[PDB]
Design an enzyme around this catalytic site. Structure first.
Site, PDB file in Angstrom:
ATOM      1  N   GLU A  76       1.137   4.540 -11.070  1.00 10.69           N
ATOM      2  CA  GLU A  76       1.901   3.706 -10.103  1.00 10.69           C
ATOM      3  C   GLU A  76       2.184   2.355 -10.773  1.00 10.69           C
ATOM      4  O   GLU A  76       3.326   1.851 -10.676  1.00 10.69           O
ATOM      5  CB  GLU A  76       1.142   3.489  -8.785  1.00 10.69           C
ATOM      6  CG  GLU A  76       1.162   4.669  -7.834  1.00 10.69           C
ATOM      7  CD  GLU A  76       2.522   5.113  -7.296  1.00 10.69           C
ATOM      8  OE1 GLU A  76       2.531   6.081  -6.485  1.00 10.69           O
ATOM      9  OE2 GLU A  76       3.564   4.523  -7.691  1.00 10.69           O
ATOM     10  N   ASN A 118       6.007   0.931 -12.238  1.00 10.06           N
ATOM     11  CA  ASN A 118       6.539  -0.390 -11.841  1.00 10.06           C
ATOM     12  C   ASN A 118       7.030  -1.159 -13.074  1.00 10.06           C
ATOM     13  O   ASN A 118       8.030  -1.927 -12.923  1.00 10.06           O
ATOM     14  CB  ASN A 118       5.507  -1.190 -11.063  1.00 10.06           C
ATOM     15  CG  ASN A 118       5.370  -0.756  -9.620  1.00 10.06           C
ATOM     16  OD1 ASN A 118       6.252  -0.070  -9.080  1.00 10.06           O
ATOM     17  ND2 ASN A 118       4.291  -1.198  -8.983  1.00 10.06           N
ATOM     18  N   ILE A 137       3.661  -7.948  -1.630  1.00  3.17           N
ATOM     19  CA  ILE A 137       3.759  -6.686  -2.409  1.00  3.17           C
ATOM     20  C   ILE A 137       2.387  -6.002  -2.466  1.00  3.17           C
ATOM     21  O   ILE A 137       2.313  -4.759  -2.395  1.00  3.17           O
ATOM     22  CB  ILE A 137       4.351  -7.008  -3.793  1.00  3.17           C
ATOM     23  CG1 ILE A 137       5.868  -7.186  -3.685  1.00  3.17           C
ATOM     24  CG2 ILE A 137       3.955  -5.975  -4.825  1.00  3.17           C
ATOM     25  CD1 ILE A 137       6.444  -8.066  -4.756  1.00  3.17           C
ATOM     26  N   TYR A 156      16.894  -3.947  -9.045  1.00  4.89           N
ATOM     27  CA  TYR A 156      16.847  -2.768  -9.934  1.00  4.89           C
ATOM     28  C   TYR A 156      18.051  -1.897  -9.572  1.00  4.89           C
ATOM     29  O   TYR A 156      18.135  -1.441  -8.428  1.00  4.89           O
ATOM     30  CB  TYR A 156      15.543  -1.987  -9.744  1.00  4.89           C
ATOM     31  CG  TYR A 156      14.256  -2.755  -9.931  1.00  4.89           C
ATOM     32  CD1 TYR A 156      13.703  -3.494  -8.900  1.00  4.89           C
ATOM     33  CD2 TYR A 156      13.565  -2.703 -11.133  1.00  4.89           C
ATOM     34  CE1 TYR A 156      12.516  -4.188  -9.061  1.00  4.89           C
ATOM     35  CE2 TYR A 156      12.371  -3.383 -11.306  1.00  4.89           C
ATOM     36  CZ  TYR A 156      11.836  -4.121 -10.266  1.00  4.89           C
ATOM     37  OH  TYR A 156      10.643  -4.767 -10.428  1.00  4.89           O
ATOM     38  N   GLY A 176       3.603   1.867  -3.738  1.00  4.11           N
ATOM     39  CA  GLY A 176       2.897   2.203  -4.992  1.00  4.11           C
ATOM     40  C   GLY A 176       1.677   1.330  -5.284  1.00  4.11           C
ATOM     41  O   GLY A 176       0.544   1.841  -5.211  1.00  4.11           O
ATOM     42  N   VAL A 177       1.902   0.060  -5.630  1.00  3.27           N
ATOM     43  CA  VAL A 177       0.826  -0.873  -6.067  1.00  3.27           C
ATOM     44  C   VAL A 177       0.057  -1.424  -4.850  1.00  3.27           C
ATOM     45  O   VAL A 177      -1.087  -1.814  -5.056  1.00  3.27           O
ATOM     46  CB  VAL A 177       1.392  -1.998  -6.952  1.00  3.27           C
ATOM     47  CG1 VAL A 177       2.067  -3.077  -6.121  1.00  3.27           C
ATOM     48  CG2 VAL A 177       0.325  -2.584  -7.862  1.00  3.27           C
ATOM     49  N   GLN A 192       6.938  12.429  -0.319  1.00  4.99           N
ATOM     50  CA  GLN A 192       6.384  11.208  -0.958  1.00  4.99           C
ATOM     51  C   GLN A 192       6.066  11.416  -2.452  1.00  4.99           C
ATOM     52  O   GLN A 192       6.089  10.421  -3.175  1.00  4.99           O
ATOM     53  CB  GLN A 192       5.109  10.756  -0.249  1.00  4.99           C
ATOM     54  CG  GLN A 192       4.862   9.272  -0.431  1.00  4.99           C
ATOM     55  CD  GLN A 192       3.630   8.792   0.290  1.00  4.99           C
ATOM     56  OE1 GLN A 192       3.334   9.239   1.401  1.00  4.99           O
ATOM     57  NE2 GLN A 192       2.921   7.868  -0.343  1.00  4.99           N
ATOM     58  N   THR A 193       5.756  12.634  -2.906  1.00  8.46           N
ATOM     59  CA  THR A 193       5.288  12.909  -4.297  1.00  8.46           C
ATOM     60  C   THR A 193       6.467  12.818  -5.280  1.00  8.46           C
ATOM     61  O   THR A 193       6.221  12.796  -6.491  1.00  8.46           O
ATOM     62  CB  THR A 193       4.661  14.302  -4.451  1.00  8.46           C
ATOM     63  OG1 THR A 193       5.736  15.214  -4.260  1.00  8.46           O
ATOM     64  CG2 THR A 193       3.568  14.625  -3.456  1.00  8.46           C
TER      65      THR A 193
HETATM   66  N1  LIG Z   1       5.473  -4.995 -12.950  1.00  2.47           N
HETATM   67  C1  LIG Z   1       6.282  -5.509 -12.025  1.00  2.47           C
HETATM   68  N2  LIG Z   1       7.191  -6.463 -12.364  1.00  2.47           N
HETATM   69  C2  LIG Z   1       8.016  -6.941 -11.413  1.00  2.47           C
HETATM   70  N3  LIG Z   1       8.067  -6.647 -10.111  1.00  2.47           N
HETATM   71  C3  LIG Z   1       7.154  -5.704  -9.811  1.00  2.47           C
HETATM   72  C4  LIG Z   1       6.256  -5.104 -10.679  1.00  2.47           C
HETATM   73  N4  LIG Z   1       5.468  -4.187 -10.005  1.00  2.47           N
HETATM   74  C5  LIG Z   1       5.864  -4.268  -8.760  1.00  2.47           C
HETATM   75  N5  LIG Z   1       6.898  -5.154  -8.587  1.00  2.47           N
HETATM   76  C6  LIG Z   1       7.583  -5.476  -7.344  1.00  2.47           C
HETATM   77  O1  LIG Z   1       6.751  -5.109  -6.262  1.00  2.47           O
HETATM   78  C7  LIG Z   1       7.468  -4.180  -5.410  1.00  2.47           C
HETATM   79  C8  LIG Z   1       6.485  -3.246  -4.754  1.00  2.47           C
HETATM   80  O2  LIG Z   1       6.038  -2.263  -5.731  1.00  2.47           O
HETATM   81  P1  LIG Z   1       5.356  -0.935  -5.161  1.00  2.47           P
HETATM   82  O3  LIG Z   1       4.923  -0.055  -6.304  1.00  2.47           O
HETATM   83  O4  LIG Z   1       4.381  -1.320  -4.081  1.00  2.47           O
HETATM   84  O5  LIG Z   1       6.625  -0.226  -4.443  1.00  2.47           O
HETATM   85  P2  LIG Z   1       8.016   0.253  -5.102  1.00  2.47           P
HETATM   86  O6  LIG Z   1       7.797   0.245  -6.569  1.00  2.47           O
HETATM   87  O7  LIG Z   1       9.121  -0.582  -4.532  1.00  2.47           O
HETATM   88  O8  LIG Z   1       8.154   1.771  -4.588  1.00  2.47           O
HETATM   89  P3  LIG Z   1       7.136   3.060  -4.761  1.00  2.47           P
HETATM   90  O9  LIG Z   1       6.214   3.085  -3.563  1.00  2.47           O
HETATM   91  O10 LIG Z   1       8.017   4.271  -4.815  1.00  2.47           O
HETATM   92  O11 LIG Z   1       6.389   2.818  -6.055  1.00  2.47           O
HETATM   93  C9  LIG Z   1       8.479  -3.531  -6.357  1.00  2.47           C
HETATM   94  O12 LIG Z   1       9.555  -2.959  -5.623  1.00  2.47           O
HETATM   95  C10 LIG Z   1       8.912  -4.744  -7.175  1.00  2.47           C
HETATM   96  O13 LIG Z   1       9.873  -5.541  -6.502  1.00  2.47           O
END
Ligand SMILES: Nc1ncnc2c1ncn2[C@@H]1O[C@H](COP(=O)(O)OP(=O)(O)OP(=O)(O)O)[C@@H](O)[C@H]1O
Ligand SMILES: Nc1ncnc2c1ncn2[C@@H]1O[C@H](COP(=O)(O)OP(=O)(O)OP(=O)(O)O)[C@@H](O)[C@H]1O
Ligand SMILES: [Cl-]
Ligand SMILES: [Cl-]
EC number: 5.6.2.2
Lengths: 390, 390
Positions: free
Chosen positions: A39, A43, A91, A106, A116-117, A332-333
């Protein structure tokens, strides 16, 4: 007994700790544990797809934590106008929060859910976040998804990027609790093949093992890598890269001597283990093109009488990698691509370019037809032999 | 460009409309559309598992809406002490909200996420909710997940239960937009087999087609039903139902003349298309027991030299249905069971009871051994014949 007080609302990240299967996956066989790392990596890869990150370092620490460092733009540090805390904390602590709900930050991203994070954080007994952005170093520590203090400026820097190090919760992950070098390496190798010009480093601080993935050749080299220990039966890897009506299609394929079909599908670098519209388009085109070629070259007699789609794919290695502004998956996967417009995008490109390939490489084309016929003959011998045992 | 203002928080049910793939699945091939009905049915089945519902009516209306009526306890109508609206409205409008986060309301439930019917609501241009509870009839209308007025008492009743009728959003569902009788019937038939004493009625108001699923025989009859148009090769369906250390295990199996393996796995009546710990336990036990039996009866010579797990399962039909207080799956789709304690629960029961079965039905046992040997011989003839074509 069963009344309004039986109805419980899970708030914040509680839902992620209550049902990790829904968010990170199998918490027992190690797949979920490694998905925590993926995850964070995905990102960073999204920063690369956007043109802002050329350098990623994944580190397995000796305490079984994992860090991912990118030189992308940095997670936004500014106070979120609605939420009242840093955009970074939003986030980290809010489900369905992020910059991938539009095409503004993006153009194309494997991320789309905004979880994800926030999920990595929820299931980490500790997460350290360090952001380089707008000339400043920002640091924040989380324990079980709870921020220990507001995101704070600690230093100056002329660099940009994000460092996340996470300690997976021993309460959530069971049985397979240690990171496996090779599971992380398999995915970072494939990401190197899919992202030429992105330096991906894997460092194991347990035993000092290091890898630097910066492969020459993109998905052409990917197919060569996959056919290494098989016996490729023709030397010209079929390859193309197109962009039409906002859809990137990239394909590489080559047949080997074996009896397996291996078609690796990707959407914005995310693997589809259960395929979807890109695989369906690839398959339709491959069948139409091979059948058209065999008919025109007069080889059709066997193909016309018996040879079928399945026998085309015997000994096939291929990589189908699509770039889609707003992809849709079946779950979701993200293991199956649903976006219906992707099927004709792959199909029309393959039809045209595979036809050209077979005209431009008649030696390869005659070998592939041979392969198709041989696979039919083996299939029919096997069916016959099963019948004779009764 | 990329800053705190790029970070968007989806609130309420917005996340479900933004990414229906994550919540309902494929919005294009019809699977998601039918899953809208299954979420509502599964909620009624959970009332049945709890002992409170004996009667379910699913209706395809002539306007392509679907209703599900149960005579269970009724969705709680009382004001939610924290949320300040009816518990029913909380269930309809809040993700991760419900009575299946503990064992107080449902001892065993296919539900565990608290999102099912909140997702149906979100992706329905209209939902009508009618609750019979505490001597009162409660009615509420939603449009695109927004309540048009508070849940309101409209009448007296001495009955209990829930009626949900939903009109799927034409904005969300594409291509396959009409309910298919047979897709709904397949699942309601299987639920009848899994829930003896629950009357399940399917009514099509488009063409007046009706079915009443109240099957005699449970999963024994289920296996008979599945083997109908195959040629069962032995007459004694192997069957057992046990409960140990809070895990229900129910198995039925019978071999047929064909070359397919078909093992239908369920957890609290939810299908696992990708199996998991119940299938893994079933497989380990079947292999140990058949190998032990063949060794003891001296038939082992072929089994010892060649016959393998795969050839046991050729021509096998089986149903493995487990009841687990707090199941864990590999994903939101609940297609693979992760709960590790379920593997030894299935394995120890199968080992003991399949051993007994083979001792108590020596005619069946000799036929099944014959089948295993024949499948090895066919497999080896086929391998040999593929080699000879080269
Ligand atoms: N390494 C990074 N550099 C810059 N922005 C980041 C980074 N990692 C996360 N983000 C920001 O945080 C947001 C949330 O990330 P998160 O992984 O929670 O969800 P997502 O990537 O939008 O979708 P998914 O749940 O499918 O991974 C991202 O959409 C992005 O805007
Ligand atoms: N037919 C029903 N009768 C009684 N209570 C119901 C009924 N349908 C739903 N509920 C209540 O509403 C809650 C929310 O249901 P919902 O489908 O949103 O989530 P869930 O069933 O708890 O889990 P899942 O997301 O896995 O389906 C249920 O847990 C239950 O307490
Ligand atoms: Cl109540
Ligand atoms: Cl910012």
């Amino acid at each position: 007994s069963y009344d309004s007080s039986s109805i419980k609302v899970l708030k914040g990240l509680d839902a992620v700790r209550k049902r990790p299967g829904m968010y990170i996956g199998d918490t027992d066989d190690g797949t979920g544990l490694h998905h925590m790392a993926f995850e964070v990596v995905d990102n960073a890869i999204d920063e690369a797809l956007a043109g802002h990150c050329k350098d990623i370092v994944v580190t397995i620490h000796a305490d079984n934590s994992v860090s991912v460092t990118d030189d992308g733009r940095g997670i936004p540090t500014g106070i979120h106008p609605s939420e009242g805390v840093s955009a970074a904390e939003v986030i980290m602590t809010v489900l369905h929060a992020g910059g991938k709900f539009d095409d503004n930050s993006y153009k194309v991203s494997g991320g789309l859910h905004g979880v994800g994070v926030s999920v990595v954080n929820a299931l980490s007994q500790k997460l350290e976040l360090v952001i380089q952005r707008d000339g400043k170093i920002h640091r924040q520590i989380y324990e079980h998804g709870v921020p220990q203090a507001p995101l704070a400026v600690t230093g100056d820097t002329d660099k940009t990027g994000t460092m996340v190090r996470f300690w997976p919760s021993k309460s959530t992950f069971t049985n397979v609790t240690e990171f496996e070098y090779e599971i992380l390496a398999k995915r970072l190798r494939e990401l190197s093949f899919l992202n030429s010009g992105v330096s991906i480093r894997l460092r194991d601080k347990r035993d000092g093992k290091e890898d630097h993935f910066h492969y020459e050749g993109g998905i052409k080299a990917f197919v060569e890598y996959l056919n290494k220990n098989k016996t490729p039966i023709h030397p010209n890897i079929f390859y193309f890269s197109t962009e039409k009506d906002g859809i990137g299609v990239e394909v590489a394929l080559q047949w080997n001597d074996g009896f397996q079909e291996n078609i690796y599908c990707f959407t914005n670098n995310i693997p589809q283990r259960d395929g979807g519209t890109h695989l369906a388009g690839f398959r339709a085109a491959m069948t139409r093109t091979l059948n058209a070629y065999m008919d025109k070259e007069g080889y059709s007699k066997k193909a016309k009488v018996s040879a079928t789609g399945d026998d085309a794919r015997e000994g096939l290695i291929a990589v189908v990698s699509v770039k889609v502004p707003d992809p849709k998956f079946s779950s979701q996967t993200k293991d199956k691509l649903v976006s219906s417009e992707v099927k004709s995008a792959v199909e029309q490109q393959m039809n045209e370019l595979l036809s050209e390939y077979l005209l431009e490489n008649p030696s390869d084309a005659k070998i592939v037809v041979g392969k198709i016929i041989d696979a039919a003959r083996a299939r029919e011998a096997a069916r016959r032999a099963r019948e004779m045992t009764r």
